[PDB]
């Protein structure tokens, strides 16, 4: 680990500059996959030692910022739509499996549980680049709130849902579903339990006179909720921390007026370290030789599956919502990226199943392919209508 | 390990809690480690797995903030004294070894090179307790701006000096060159990133992206530490300490927004120094193979503490006065011992069980100087403001 980190820093500086360099260019760190990966084909494995456990512990700060940055324009305005699209992840999973199951069976003219696992893994959808474009343009506030709320909810559903599948064992159907309800409900109550303590502590006691103390305890109490998830054995540790959204609505507004900017900037800095997650796609795209060894030509079934499965269950859900506005257009625009979280699930022990290794191969190619939607977002906006 | 890191926060929360109430009490977090240890003394080793190499990677942010928090009121009047205090750490190691040589030779009624490690280790001194009291009371600014100097200067000297003895065994001739070469090399490449950081944003307009430059500042500052260890140049904490030029040049150039953000970002990590302050007690109750020795050399080390702080500053005091100083601050220099000295005490901890007694003594030294550090207010009021 001496110079292993140093590889990240040099390209990160390039990533920092390209944001200021390519400010008006036609067009992130996604480009450097060909640059940094290829030059080191000829010490080699030490670049991507990267224990899969470590990735999970550095992701919670990324998603905690998402839950702590709500502009409070959806708690009562479009909350129902987000909760309606919370069930979309179940719809996404049940449709992706319906196609990829026929994909490998007809490819050979291996089991079925990985197909269920793959569908849950693919259910994540976090278009980070798309959300960044919307906010800076200072337009379509309703459209911005739609994608942001959906992207921060399905991933929380995806992580808990894929855990239930991984522990499913064939009656035996109910307890696997019961785990999904029990863990998610436990994550909401226990996760917010530490958040409630922070809110009342800073609202009754006049602790706002000590900016250093309030900021320190806020980070520790938020971190303790994430840490308490593993200690109690309740999974969905990201969801546990993500359920600290009440901190931004109640704890944030108590009495500080000074650490308000200090707290958001602190977690924004950790949120700004997402390029380490981004580079991990391409840095390990060639270093993980044992992972991408297969590169089987089954991606064509996956390619067609991801495009239609997301599209074929967003209009019907909106149609159900139309029963009780929506511009009849945003549903088509919803087709964004395929989530940063999905990569983390693809590296879960990396050896649980032969075709499971192929999942990581498919995910990497999709990421280098789905990003054209982010690049091709502006023509999509101007194609028919805004 | 998942639950081990959890209970390290509740006692850190209590650290925040104690300072909320202790704004008027007679007087902090140093004792919470013992309280948790006693409860856990009655699964056990997993609390203090704590690889010793990982201790030296969470420590540099403490050093960087110390070098980044200079008040710029010491280099103009007390710089010569502070630079002369770099020899204090060297002469301390020269006298401590002789005092500790008689500690065991006369007691018997290891090897000499092992005693050198302990002597150089004592040169480190980080009186965080005294400095905290000074700033909050707004007292003796002249003494504060120079006491901070030696406090961090010898820490950079201590780490390189205790590493230089690795070649000691006619091998003593190149030791001085190796010590000076590494220290000089640390200043060159360590401050080079600060120069690179300064010129990068002095010409370009990074003010439109205050968030981008903050990451770049952290990325560039971290690179200096990482590049030193990767290239084999030791004194990595000293290399990051050479980031004081970041405050001299980069801090004041054009930011006007991230200046407070950068200070608060690093001081928050420096505000998490209690983790260093908490690591001792867990190892002081569970690692019976390491700390249980506690041989009857504590008093010998205890006597060596005061004389080392007295037999060295006093001879140098006359030289500095030759070119006022009121002749009073010299007696006050009998201060704390710090926390970086522990990081040297945990250098692989596996020389010999009979030789590892020095680590046991150092833990007691912090406890004995904690109450001594606590009883600082009577000393301050007695002499002068």
Numbering used by the authors:
A (entry chain B): 23 to 49, 54 to 68, 123 to 189, 199 to 259, 269 to 422, 428 to 489
B (entry chain A): 23 to 49, 54 to 68, 123 to 189, 199 to 258, 269 to 422, 428 to 489
Sentences from the study reporting this entry:
Na+/H+ exchangers (NHEs) are ancient membrane‐bound nanomachines that work to regulate intracellular pH, sodium levels and cell volume. Here, we report the cryogenic electron microscopy structure of NHE isoform 9 (SLC9A9) from Equus caballus at 3.2 Å resolution, an endosomal isoform highly expressed in the brain and associated with autism spectrum (ASD) and attention deficit hyperactivity (ADHD) disorders. Despite low sequence identity, the NHE9 architecture and ion‐binding site are remarkably similar to distantly related bacterial Na+/H+ antiporters with 13 transmembrane segments.
The EM maps were well resolved for the TMs, but a few of the connecting loop residues and a larger, extracellular loop of 52 residues, located between TM2 and TM3, could not be built. The NHE9* construct contains 97 residues of the C‐terminal regulatory domain (blue‐dotted circle), but no corresponding additional density was apparent as compared to the NHE9 ΔCTD density maps. It, therefore, seems unlikely that the C‐terminal tail in NHE9 interacts tightly with the transporter module in the absence of binding partners. As model building revealed only minor differences between NHE9* and NHE9 ΔCTD structures, the later was used for all subsequent analysis due to its moderately better resolution. Superimposition of NHE9* (wheat) and NHE9 ΔCTD (core transport domains (blue), dimerization domains (orange), linker helices (grey)) structures, which show only small differences in the most mobile regions.
